């Protein structure tokens, strides 16, 4: 309650880093082959590779 409206939106913006908890699980064999997330990680890694040649 003792926070301005602007700050408490940055609080959610930084909480959007939840990916790290999920990027790790797809590097370790925690999310073995579960769809959706397993495919999203692969097609983010593909884009990561692409930018090097053309432009962890």
């Amino acid at each position: 309650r003792g926070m301005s409206t602007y700050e408490k939106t940055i609080l959610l913006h930084e909480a959007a880093h939840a990916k790290t908890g999920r990027s790790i699980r797809a590097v370790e064999s925690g999310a073995v082959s579960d769809g959706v997330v397993y495919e999203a990680v692969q097609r983010i890694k593909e884009i990561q590779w692409y930018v090097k040649a053309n432009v962890d």
Partner: protein, 51 residues
Amino acid sequence: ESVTNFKKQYPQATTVQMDYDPLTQELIFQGVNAENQLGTTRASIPAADFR
């Protein structure tokens, strides 16, 4: 609901098999063929929402 969705996604599947994965608390569906052979279709559902 889960069975209807699974059959809607994969019309070619004739039979369905169910299995439980204790390590991640997960329920798994998979299509099966004769001669105890298994297909390529698969699905996953957490136990919390089922309960």
